């Protein structure tokens, strides 16, 4: 079985990476310019865009890529590091509102994960949780278009 989402870790933190179109993407605030481990040694990033808070390495072993969304839906679904699916209503180019706010703890460790559309295709990459007193009611995400463009 191959996975589209990788649960990754650095010495300091744990987060997620998502394979889209042959590339393993994640948030620059989690990886930085770090290289990714492989059994033949570390492999350097293929893309790095601090502005978009995006980095990309060649897709790793045991993974499969996600297909970018093309339906244009606003009913998104966030997948957490625990495999939980959270419905999100898209509010704009890079933001959506949780249909049911969750305590921030529920979304921790998930940056880099995918925002999926009704067809399970990639809409964007979860960037950051937008909190209000410890409760995550919305999220910021990097549109797949930015990834497509970076490539």
């Amino acid at each position: 079985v191959e996975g589209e989402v990788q649960i990754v870790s650095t010495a300091t933190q744990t987060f997620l990476a998502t394979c889209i179109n042959g590339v393993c993407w994640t948030v620059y605030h989690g990886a930085g310019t770090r290289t990714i481990a492989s059994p033949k040694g570390p492999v350097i990033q293929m893309y790095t865009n601090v502005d978009q808070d995006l980095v990309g390495w060649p897709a790793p072993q045991g993974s499969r890529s996600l297909t970018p969304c093309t339906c244009g839906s606003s009913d998104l679904y966030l997948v957490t590091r625990h495999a939980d699916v959270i419905p999100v209503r898209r509010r704009g180019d890079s933001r959506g509102s949780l249909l049911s706010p969750r305590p921030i703890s529920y979304l921790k460790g998930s940056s880099g994960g995918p925002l999926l559309c009704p067809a399970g295709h990639a809409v964007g990459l979860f960037r950051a949780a937008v909190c209000t007193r410890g409760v995550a009611k919305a999220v910021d995400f990097i549109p797949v278009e930015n990834l497509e463009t970076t490539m």
């Binding site: 990754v8 870790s9 290289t35």
Partner: peptide
């Protein structure tokens, strides 16, 4: 340092 893969998630729930 290096980013290591600690686990994986299959979106379809495929057991195989």
């Amino acid at each position: 340092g290096s980013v290591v893969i600690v686990g994986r998630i299959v979106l379809s729930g495929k057991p195989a």
